[PDB]
Scaffold this active site. Sequence first.
Site, PDB file in Angstrom:
ATOM      1  N   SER A   1       2.014  -0.237  11.014  1.00 48.89           N
ATOM      2  CA  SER A   1       2.610   1.048  10.603  1.00 48.89           C
ATOM      3  C   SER A   1       3.325   1.506  11.953  1.00 48.89           C
ATOM      4  O   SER A   1       4.221   2.490  11.294  1.00 48.89           O
ATOM      5  CB  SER A   1       1.548   1.751   9.856  1.00 48.89           C
ATOM      6  OG  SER A   1       0.819   1.057   8.727  1.00 48.89           O
TER       7      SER A   1
HETATM    8  C1  LIG Z   1      -0.209   0.527   9.046  1.00 48.49           C
HETATM    9  O1  LIG Z   1      -0.539   0.193  10.322  1.00 48.49           O
HETATM   10  C2  LIG Z   1      -0.890   0.171   7.770  1.00 48.49           C
HETATM   11  C3  LIG Z   1      -0.057  -0.890   6.894  1.00 48.49           C
HETATM   12  C4  LIG Z   1       0.307  -1.993   7.615  1.00 48.49           C
HETATM   13  O2  LIG Z   1      -1.096  -1.109   5.829  1.00 48.49           O
HETATM   14  C5  LIG Z   1      -1.271   1.495   7.395  1.00 48.49           C
HETATM   15  C6  LIG Z   1      -2.351   1.590   6.341  1.00 48.49           C
HETATM   16  C7  LIG Z   1      -3.145   2.944   6.829  1.00 48.49           C
HETATM   17  S1  LIG Z   1      -4.496   4.011   6.275  1.00 48.49           S
HETATM   18  C8  LIG Z   1      -4.365   4.987   4.810  1.00 48.49           C
HETATM   19  C9  LIG Z   1      -3.440   6.164   5.315  1.00 48.49           C
HETATM   20  N1  LIG Z   1      -2.759   7.084   3.929  1.00 48.49           N
HETATM   21  C10 LIG Z   1      -2.688   8.820   3.872  1.00 48.49           C
HETATM   22  N2  LIG Z   1      -3.392   9.731   4.228  1.00 48.49           N
HETATM   23  C11 LIG Z   1      -2.247   3.507   8.091  1.00 48.49           C
HETATM   24  C12 LIG Z   1      -2.547   4.485   9.101  1.00 48.49           C
HETATM   25  O3  LIG Z   1      -3.039   4.463  10.209  1.00 48.49           O
HETATM   26  O4  LIG Z   1      -2.190   5.651   8.475  1.00 48.49           O
HETATM   27  N3  LIG Z   1      -1.461   2.725   8.260  1.00 48.49           N
END
Ligand SMILES: *C(=O)[C@H]([C@@H](C)O)[C@H]1CC(SCCNC=N)=C(C(=O)O)N1
Length: 493
Positions: free
Chosen positions: A235
């Site tokens: 991400s």
């Molecule tokens: C990124 O590294 C991942 C992607 C590849 O799925 C995402 C999933 C999450 S965790 C939920 C966040 N939602 C809202 N508060 C993250 C993150 O570290 O934010 N990245």
Amino acid sequence: VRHIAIPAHRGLITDRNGEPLAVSTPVTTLWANPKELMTAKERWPQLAAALGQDTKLFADRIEQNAEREFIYLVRGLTPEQGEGVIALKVPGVYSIEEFRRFYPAGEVVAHAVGFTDVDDRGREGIELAFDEWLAGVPGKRQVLKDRVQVTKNAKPGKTLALSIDLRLQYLAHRELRNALLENGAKAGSLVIMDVKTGEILAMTNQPTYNPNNRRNLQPAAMRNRAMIDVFEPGSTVKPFSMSAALASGRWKPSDIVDVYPGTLQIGRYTIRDVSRNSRQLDLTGILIKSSNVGISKIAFDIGAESIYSVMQQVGLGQDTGLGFPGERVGNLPNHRKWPKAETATLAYGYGLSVTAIQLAHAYAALANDGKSVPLSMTRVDRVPDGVQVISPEVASTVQGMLQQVVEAQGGVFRAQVPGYHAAGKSGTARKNAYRSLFAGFAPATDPRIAMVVVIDEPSKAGYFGGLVSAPVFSKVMAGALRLMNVPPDNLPT
Ligand SMILES: *C(=O)[C@H]([C@@H](C)O)[C@H]1CC(SCCNC=N)=C(C(=O)O)N1
């Protein structure tokens, strides 16, 4: 035998403020001519005893070398120690002035500085990278025997000031180690860069080692993780995918993507969001919610080539040009034509492999209004012109989106920096081995510093970047900005 080298004083390594990091210190080395020592066997046991050596092991070493004219007895003694042995007046025993490196900050800056080997040659880190600058030129002493002159003077090595700020390095080292203990993690990295100058202000890895005492040492502690650990950044590269989208001319930040129900079928594959509570999201919302579905839909609209180009221009999976020993490049595959599955996976960061140093440099380009300045491990006095890799308009827009990722409701609140607007993105890296990441910069409205925190994950199919790494960023960024006298920017408009 005929010529004996006169060791040269090796250049002092300091941090950017002149604090000592590697110092060449005079030491006394004892050597012997076994041919003359063989005529004074009765003196050997006192000499072995003065050296703290076993009588038999010492005698066997002389006997086996009886036809040689030079052997070291001991290296690195203090001048006071050498004098006591020389006072014994043992035939064939001589003292030589040598230089030995000492590392005052020790484990705090072990990987960046590196060390020299037994012969005072750079072996790791800066000691090796800048060996030609540091080493200087040894002199020569002609020794003529039966069946001494100075020929060529020794020239000292040159002082080198690193880009590292020992104050920031110590703060990072302390906070990374705190975070590792708190979360039961065994390894991690933290990189701090000056976005304007390309300087690496701090580069700390855990575990670390004391370069002053390298006997025993586990090889895991030797690993310069920030430069050698390669991983899929996940991400944390979505801001680069968004930069490609805003540069395409097809997307404004207020544009909407419908991500419901948090999954997207593309032929045989299913792209899935971790957080599945959304329908319409604007471009900032895609980053706040870290929606893989949203970024993938944008990626299909703009094409993977545009995303690949931005990532390549910011240096992800590219050479750093540092010339640092062991530094790895990773890989950003130029598929030339990307199917949907490869397009999506690139856009959300699983289609490339990078290092923490590369990720920090890419965030530095975004923070520096889209201008990439080449990386430096040495103090930068004259800043290079650099390259405008992302348009200033797009970089300014993405900076605002990332400030919302940290500050908005549902954002990475643990990354907020008191007194300043901060910007950044969390993520889970994949190597399957996992890492929790946070990458960002501050002050968000007029950036000065970029930072990447990598914490190795024991994990259980979870995403902890915003829980484990974001608080490290908060604490280290607050301390770094204050140490650099950066004015607080969160003031009444
Ligand atoms: C990124 O590294 C991942 C992607 C590849 O799925 C995402 C999933 C999450 S965790 C939920 C966040 N939602 C809202 N508060 C993250 C993150 O570290 O934010 N990245």
